Amino acid sequence: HHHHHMIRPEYLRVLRKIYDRLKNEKVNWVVTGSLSFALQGVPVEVHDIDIQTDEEGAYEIERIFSEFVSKKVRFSSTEKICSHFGELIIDGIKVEIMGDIRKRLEDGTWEDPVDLNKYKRFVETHGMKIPVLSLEYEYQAYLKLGRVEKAETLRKWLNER
């Protein structure tokens, strides 16, 4: 953990609550977003918890954490990214559930969702074996989001004309 950076205990507490209910379920899930970076030693503050999973996993997670569901899992799509998307709030912390995230391809097709198991690693942390997507994958994913943002920004700037 570069910089001996520590994840704020509120996030670890909620992560434990999530881990405890998923650990012995057949759910294909990973922590993604900032918490995945942090768990893998990148000193970044976490503000919410992102769980990426497959389509079935999103609905299973929602059911497992039914009392915490703030937004029902629904297939949700922009023109760029879609997923089976819902939200939990646990102890005031937002948990984004994203099942089978797919990115739009140049041709308008949707990429197949990632094989989470190609990139999943288990981080031993605070007595928990937490599945995360690899830093390499995460970095590449954010850089890709970045490209999308840049293209959209340029389009919007031009649209203002």
Binding site residues, Na ion, CB under 5 A: 1, 5-7, 28, 38, 43
Residue numbers after which the chain breaks, C to N beyond 2.5 angstroms: none
Q: Which two tokens stand for residue 29?
A: 């899930």
Element counts in the chain: helices (H) and strands (E)? 5, 7
Q: Which is nearer to Na ion, 53 or 83 (CB)?
A: 53
CB nearer to Na ion: give 28 or 83. 28
User: Considering beta carbons, is residue 83 or 125 the nearer one to Na ion?
Assistant: 125
**Least distance from C-beta 93 to Na ion, angstroms?**
15
- Give me the helices (H) in 23-68, please: 33-39, 55-64
As measured in angstroms, the least distance from the Cβ of 70 to Na ion is: 25
The nearest distance, CB 63 to Na ion, in angstroms, is 17
Would you call 78 helix, strand, or coil by DSSP? coil
- Rounded least distance, CB 158 to Na ion, Å: 39
Question: Rounded to whole angstroms, what are the CA distances from 109 to 53, 56, 103, 106?
Answer: 21, 21, 9, 7
Element at 143 (helix H, strand E)? helix 135-159
4 or 156: CB nearest Na ion:
4
Residue closer to Na ion by CB (options 139, 153) is 139
Q: Which residue of this chain has its Cβ atom nearest to Na ion in the complex?
A: 28
The least CB distance from residue 1 to Na ion, in Å, is 4
Q: What is the token pair recorded at 93?
A: 């912390």
